[PDB]
Write a protein that binds this ligand. Structure first.
Ligand SMILES: Cn1ccc(C(=O)NC[C@@H]2CCCO2)n1
Ligand SMILES: Cn1ccc(C(=O)NC[C@@H]2CCCO2)n1
Ligand SMILES: Cn1ccc(C(=O)NC[C@@H]2CCCO2)n1
Ligand SMILES: [Zn+2]
Ligand SMILES: [Zn+2]
Ligand SMILES: [Zn+2]
Ligand SMILES: [Zn+2]
Lengths: 69, 69
């Protein structure tokens, strides 16, 4: 029904929000520290000097294990 | 249809996986460092000396800003 299409769209949008903002292909699993923005996969987070969201200096990257993974 | 019910169940399970594993009421927004398990809201994470998934000592809690929030 039309309700099935509405739920499919909500599911798709939630799943897309869990994907890396740089490559759009891999799951987010890395946090820029200390700012806390958690928006990249490990490969994309590895060479960034500053956060792509807030421009804060990246002191290090923390790997995250999420129950949605 | 029956697919509306199946999609409603998938959406609910994905949303539940984003909720704190301890209080079951607030969104996950905190990482236990250094292990990386990201399973709690800030209130439950502040009260735990050991990670509830792997039992490693919590050296500190990193707040995470996620696009799914
Ligand atoms: C971050 N974001 C939003 C939407 C998408 C997306 O549709 N990406 C396409 C690829 C194809 C294989 C994995 O997703 N990514
Ligand atoms: C008979 N039954 C048991 C569970 C459901 C169900 O989840 N229905 C889908 C709902 C209706 C509102 C849109 O999603 N139906
Ligand atoms: C972690 N988790 C799994 C399922 C649930 C759950 O159903 N929680 C109930 C509360 C009521 C207000 C917010 O969710 N939580
Ligand atoms: Zn990436
Ligand atoms: Zn940032
Ligand atoms: Zn909690
Ligand atoms: Zn742990």
């Amino acid at each position: 029904s039309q309700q099935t299409r509405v739920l499919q769209e909500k599911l798709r949008k939630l799943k897309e929000a869990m994907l890396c903002m740089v490559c759009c292909e891999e799951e987010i699993n890395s946090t820029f520290c200390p700012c806390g923005h958690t928006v990249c996969c490990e490969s994309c987070a590895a060479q960034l000097q500053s956060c792509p969201v807030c421009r804060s200096r990246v002191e290090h990257v923390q790997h995250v294990y999420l129950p949605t993974h």
